[PDB]
Design a protein around this ligand. Structure first.
Ligand SMILES: CCCCCCCC/C=C\CCCCCCCC(=O)O[C@H](COC(=O)CCCCCCCCCCCCCCC)COP(=O)(O)OC[C@@H](O)CO
Ligand SMILES: COc1ccc(S(=O)(=O)N2CCC[C@H]2C(=O)Nc2cc(C)cc(C)c2)cc1
Ligand SMILES: CCCCCCCCS[C@@H]1O[C@H](CO)[C@@H](O)[C@H](O)[C@H]1O
Ligand SMILES: CCCCCCCCS[C@@H]1O[C@H](CO)[C@@H](O)[C@H](O)[C@H]1O
Ligand SMILES: CCCCCCCCS[C@@H]1O[C@H](CO)[C@@H](O)[C@H](O)[C@H]1O
Length: 298
């Protein structure tokens, strides 16, 4: 008698509740990431004491996050709902390209933040870190990120079956080599180097010198948290694409709905990172929190 009651859940209640959780998480992250990263930029613009090398890199990180949130997030939500591509051939190349560029700008900015902190803290006076040179490095980050993701744009193809956007690979081996390289370069190597750098920064940082020590320890604490949430937020999708592209996993159709759910949550986590960073600055930086509240109360 309760077969009908269970089927109503299986066929209507659950599907509606799951589409609802999906759209609500994607929308909340959209709003929070857009507003918070814009506030990061406006805060750095308003408070001159915040115009440090690190904060310039953090505004660039917020700029990359705003790019991915404004353009890629709505499209990623539509793909995760319908498992189909509704934006045409050109956008099938452009949107994935901007997603890869956003990831590359983000990880290089964190790398250069860790490099600046490592030279400033661990081997001092060797290299000068000025805001104009930091701005030069920022332009170089965009130049590299835009150049090295061109192959990513090149492999995208939009083909019908109701269109579907996916990578078109000429050989069995090329996707494995490319995604091995992509994983090692945009995730594992920069984050491992940053972890050893921040480990050394932590060991070296832990009487008038103490005033400097009080400010630098707080920012370093904040920066390590930024790196950690990044490594955590990007870990699942990065691992999943490797298992899919290098190891050939997730091709059985008996569990197609479970794989869609896992990839959808991992996509959502990438965007959740853009929402998460401004909250991190608000709770680990007193200057940022004050500027956000000066903006917040208006
Ligand atoms: C795509 C490229 C983009 C690059 C973008 C640039 C990003 C750059 C960011 C920061 C650079 C900072 C580098 C800091 C490196 C610090 C490395 C280091 O010393 O760490 C050790 C711990 O691990 C060790 O033993 C050595 C651990 C070895 C095992 C590592 C496994 C690989 C994981 C990771 C793979 C990365 C490899 C990249 C190679 C090019 C020891 O600590 P400790 O205080 O005792 O030292 C005292 C000692 O220096 C006395 O001689
Ligand atoms: C290491 O961390 C990562 C993080 C993300 C990826 S990715 O899978 O997102 N990516 C690979 C090809 C390029 C990019 C991709 O397909 N974008 C994308 C695809 C669709 C259909 C829709 C949207 C909005 C973006 C890979 C590694
Ligand atoms: C954690 C797992 C997440 C899976 C998400 C699946 C969302 C849609 S449920 C779907 O509803 C249909 C209604 O017609 C039924 O016919 C199917 O049997 C059932 O699968
Ligand atoms: C393509 C132009 C991009 C503009 C970004 C500027 C990058 C730094 S220029 C550099 O600034 C240093 C500041 O300390 C001076 O010491 C040097 O003499 C001068 O060469
Ligand atoms: C011994 C092996 C020799 C292989 C020679 C052919 C190499 C083809 S690369 C090919 O270029 C395309 C350009 O569009 C991409 O779309 C594909 O994904 C990619 O695979």
């Amino acid at each position: 008698e309760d077969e009908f009651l269970r089927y109503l859940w299986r066929d209507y209640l659950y599907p509606k509740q799951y589409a609802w959780v999906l759209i609500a998480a994607y929308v909340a992250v959209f709003v929070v990431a857009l507003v918070g990263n814009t506030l990061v930029c406006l805060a750095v613009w308003r408070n001159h004491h915040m115009r440090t090398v690190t904060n310039y890199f953090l505004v660039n990180l917020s700029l990359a996050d705003v790019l991915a949130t404004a353009i890629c997030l709505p499209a990623s939500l539509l793909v995760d709902i319908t498992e189909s591509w509704l934006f045409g051939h050109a956008l099938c190349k452009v949107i994935p390209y901007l997603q890869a560029v956003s990831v590359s700008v983000a990880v290089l900015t964190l790398s250069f933040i860790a490099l600046d902190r490592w030279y400033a803290i661990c081997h001092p006076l060797l290299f000068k870190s000025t805001a104009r040179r930091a701005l030069g490095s920022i332009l170089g980050i965009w130049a590299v990120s835009l150049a090295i993701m061109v192959p990513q744009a090149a492999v995208m193809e939009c083909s019908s079956v109701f269109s579907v956007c996916d990578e078109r690979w000429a050989d069995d081996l090329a996707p494995k080599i490319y995604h091995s390289c992509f994983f090692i370069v945009t995730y594992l190597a920069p984050l491992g180097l940053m972890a050893m750098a921040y480990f050394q920064i932590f060991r070296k940082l832990w009487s008038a010198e103490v005033k400097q020590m009080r400010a630098r320890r707080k920012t370093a604490k904040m920066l390590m948290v930024v790196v950690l949430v990044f490594a955590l937020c990007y870990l699942p999708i990065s691992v999943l694409n490797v298992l899919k592209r290098v190891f050939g996993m997730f091709r059985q159709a008996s569990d197609r709905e479970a794989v869609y759910a896992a990839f959808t949550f991992s996509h959502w986590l990438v965007y959740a990172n853009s929402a998460a960073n401004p909250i991190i600055y608000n709770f680990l930086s007193g200057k940022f929190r004050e500027q956000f509240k000066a903006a917040f109360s208006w």
